[PDB]
Design a protein around this ligand. Structure first.
Ligand code: NA
Ligand code: NA
Length: 262
């Protein structure tokens, strides 16, 4: 038999538990000021209250162009309530390009491990990155330049670079069908196609959604982000059951591609 996974947290998942507003863990918050944050413009840290089940993995989430922390803040308690330490960040300037946001994502993870007040609750060897729009472009660049990351979830990503053939981090790209700012035909889909065949990857296209779909509470985005982070940050195979959907059975999903090598 396969060895027991020590990174498993929370009870066995179901479809109703993943689509719920909150997970099985209570969440507390703490803030990081812009001036004390070295490399990024501060943010808020979301962490589970209880530690009796062991340490958790850390996730850094970046907003998009001319966007602040509040546009992605709903992912904070949504992801943390399932057993993750999440930091939503602000950028140094609201006009920072994707390559600049990639550096600020790793700087936020560096703060979580070395300087944050919740560093004792974090497993430093299991980190992930997320982002919306240009933050999603910075997510791809961070995963390419930091292969030690466990997962990466670009949300309607935007980037001038379409070549991501060196990304070794399991990447879940979530695109919007009617995206007019970062069209999937020139952004999300070329990003997914350029990812290596040996890298676990998936492309989720939201049916009839706009570019700002990730800026509000979304059941589809929340369920598959939890499943992806659980599957690769925690190696939790209990969440693999949620990663093989049929788009014709979900009105919120218009497309789904996925390749798993391991
Ligand atoms: Na700063
Ligand atoms: Na559908």
């Amino acid at each position: 038999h396969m060895a027991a996974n020590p990174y498993e947290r929370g009870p066995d998942p179901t479809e109703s538990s993943l689509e719920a507003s909150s997970g099985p863990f209570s969440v507390s918050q703490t803030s990081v000021s812009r001036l004390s944050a070295s490399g990024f413009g501060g943010g808020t840290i979301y962490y589970p209250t209880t530690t009796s089940e062991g340490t958790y993995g850390a996730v850094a989430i970046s907003p998009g162009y001319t966007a602040t922390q509040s546009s992605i803040a709903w992912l904070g308690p949504r992801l943390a309530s399932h057993g993750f330490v999440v930091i939503t960040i602000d950028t140094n300037t609201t006009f920072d390009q994707p390559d600049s946001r990639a550096r600020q994502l790793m700087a936020a993870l560096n703060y979580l491990v070395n300087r944050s007040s919740v560093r004792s609750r974090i497993d430093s060897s299991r980190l992930a990155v997320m982002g919306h729009s240009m933050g999603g472009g910075g997510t791809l660049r961070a995963a390419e330049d930091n292969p030690s990351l466990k997962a990466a979830i670009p949300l309607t990503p935007w980037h001038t670079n379409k070549n991501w053939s060196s990304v070794r981090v399991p990447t879940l790209i979530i695109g919007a069908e009617n995206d007019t700012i970062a069209p999937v035909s020139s952004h999300a889909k070329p990003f997914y196609n350029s990812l290596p065949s040996s890298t676990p990857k998936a492309y989720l296209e939201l049916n009839g959604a706009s570019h700002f779909a990730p800026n509000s509470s979304n059941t589809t985005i929340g369920k598959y982000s939890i499943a992806w982070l659980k599957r690769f940050v925690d190696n939790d195979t209990r969440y693999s059951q949620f990663l093989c959907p049929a788009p014709h059975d979900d009105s919120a999903i218009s497309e789904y591609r996925s390749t798993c090598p391991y």
